Amino acid sequence: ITNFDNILFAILTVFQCITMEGWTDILYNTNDAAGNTWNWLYFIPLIIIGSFFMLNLVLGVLSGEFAKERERVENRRAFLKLRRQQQIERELNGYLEWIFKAEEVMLAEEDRNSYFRRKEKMFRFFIRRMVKAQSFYWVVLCVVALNTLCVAMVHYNQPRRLTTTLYFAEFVFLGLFLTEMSLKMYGLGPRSYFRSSFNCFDFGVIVGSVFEVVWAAIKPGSSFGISVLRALRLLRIFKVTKYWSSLRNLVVSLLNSMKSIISLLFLLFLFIVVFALLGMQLFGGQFNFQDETPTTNFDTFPAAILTVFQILTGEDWNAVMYHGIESQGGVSKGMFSSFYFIVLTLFGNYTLLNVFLAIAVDNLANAQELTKDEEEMEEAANQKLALQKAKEVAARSVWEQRASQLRLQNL
Amino acid sequence: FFIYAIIGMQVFGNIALDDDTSINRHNNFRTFLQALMLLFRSATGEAWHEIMLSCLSNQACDEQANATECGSDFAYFYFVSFIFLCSFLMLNLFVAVIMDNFEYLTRDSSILGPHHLDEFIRVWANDMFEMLKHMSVHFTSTLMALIRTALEITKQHQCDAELRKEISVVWANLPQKTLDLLVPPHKP
Amino acid sequence: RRFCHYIVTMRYFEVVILVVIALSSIALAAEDPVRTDSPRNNALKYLDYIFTGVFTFEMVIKMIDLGLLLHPGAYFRDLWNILDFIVVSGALVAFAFSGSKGKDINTIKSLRVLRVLRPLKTIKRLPKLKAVFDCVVNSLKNVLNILIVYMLFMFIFAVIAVQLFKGKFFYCTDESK
Amino acid sequence: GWPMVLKHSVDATYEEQGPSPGYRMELSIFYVVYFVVFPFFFVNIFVAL
């Protein structure tokens, strides 16, 4: 199948080299057939001009299209709404801080003069300062880092003392994290605990950890690997850096557009399903000619969907193409079944890139303008505040520049 | 590529060419050209992990190699570091070439640019009316005036002052009357 | 003598050092790994002796001019100077240990591999290559906050993979035991 | 060589036991979820950033 015996065969082999899949198998074949001195001149320029230069062209065109889409009236309106709600959330946090400090001092002056309710509220308020201090945060981070350390020394043939040690350490860490979750509930309330996206994730991971502990009690062998997710709480270390704004805004944009990310990953699933059904129609029950059925067959639907996914990831798609050509005859008459894989690797290696680069560019940019706008409004508010308070006492990336120009043009 | 090729030659050069391994007679570190071909093969991600496993410690050495023990577990760092270093540098090259043309990748048809100037050069073949019917002190002055129509920086005198300021900013390399020639053409 | 060392660094020395580095890189490309006893390897060994001598001379010139580490704006204040120390000292130490005695084996190959840092001198000796390197490092600093998140997520995935497949990737040569 | 790792992962039965082909095909979701995240999403985050 991989020969230059014809223009169609030459196009097929060249296209298979473009996808950089087994392009060295063909190069080695021409190193055995002919001399190996000149064969690199055919194939290394082939790879550079077809897979590196054309991928650069694709990335450039897609990035330009995403930039033009971003500075368009409807998407601009959506981002303006997102920034408005982030501004209002910061304002509400500050004002609720005012009200909480006031309620604390009111409780203090009421107590210095219903007693059970007063004591309960005072204890709740002491917890609420405790769960927000810069010492509880570091204690929680140290506990997480000790829990990350325990799961990271789980190897094969670990000492029999280590298995029980980590069993009891898992129980101890679960107790500690239920304690932390309960304390944050009590100090903040379910209404305000779940306001934070990290707190919802942690609550979900605590529930998953309890479920996994119960399941392992039922079946002493199984391991869902959900307690390891408590290592994502190490992302709170970014809170004490200057990188907090950009990452928090990236997560905010991801959450905001999650109704369009789920819908995006469902179209990928629908196209994978369509190509799996087509693969069962064409090559269903016909990969048994080699005297054994491959792992990547199209007989069952899980197998077909896994084969389609593996062709989308672009690993050994050419081997599956050869097997599907021989399954339908051979090089003699089954070579028109190579259009299934050509279409699935063109419209599957470029829609994957299209969708995931759309997600990444859109949300990363939204994060960039969010953090830049909040920084600029911080400094503008500071300077206006200065010039009003003193009244009464007596570079950018090419993407951002082009985005500003596009915004001006579209306005 | 050169540094990694030399490292591969020195460390991984004397492994025995077995066709059932991934250090073939096609894919050896035995010469600079062959090591550099192996690096280009792994840059494109062509079973680079099998090469790494064929380069690990305790491999059969070549018949004409003095050292009996050949291959090292340095191949882990070698191949992992090459993979993501090459990926990062190639992606930086891609992004540099992309942003070098970002005003063209984001180009919008309505707004006039270099295509307009090339079209006006082609107009050479009065014809201004036909061109404007086909469009989104002899010809250079008309070029400047039509660029003025393309984007706005009496109002005519204010624009002349803007153009004089621009000319002062971008005065040519010792030109007698080139930017001043544009100013005499920008007078109308 | 420091004025002499200063003028030696400005009498078209940069281009000579660039030519030396380029020729030594070519020499590195020319060595035969499989046949360590080749005559070509002997000729390139003598060439490497010459190149090591040249680099040691430049090294001591920079010692006398800049001064080792005392004051600001001196040697060892730029990592390129430490890299030059690594290259030169590794070559000299390998030469000292290259007594052809056969006492140790694994060390000499590593100290010969230490020569591959030689082309990385040009990345500083050429200002435009230094600018490109600085741009690349700036990109690496830009994506460093997402590299940490990437490594963390891949660490959770790796630990889940361990818990799923720890000790299970064993097999017999026959598929029946 | 990711599908060979997938094959070894599914065929894996138990600790210190040999493979049983076809066993544990539910563990193909670990690699589908991994591909959705790192090769697809995170790498595109690097490219976009």
């Binding site: 054994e292 491959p294 097997h323 | 059932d20 391994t21 991934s22 | 097999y171 017999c172 | 060589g1 060979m4």
Partner: peptide, 25 residues
């Protein structure tokens, strides 16, 4: 799991310690 040099198929991936290259492990 096919040994080194055994005749194999690429898509089978039953090529323990290597990969099926040119029909041989």
């Amino acid at each position: 799991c096919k040994g080194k040099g055994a005749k194999c198929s690429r898509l089978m991936y039953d090529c323990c310690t290597g990969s099926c290259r040119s029909g041989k492990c």
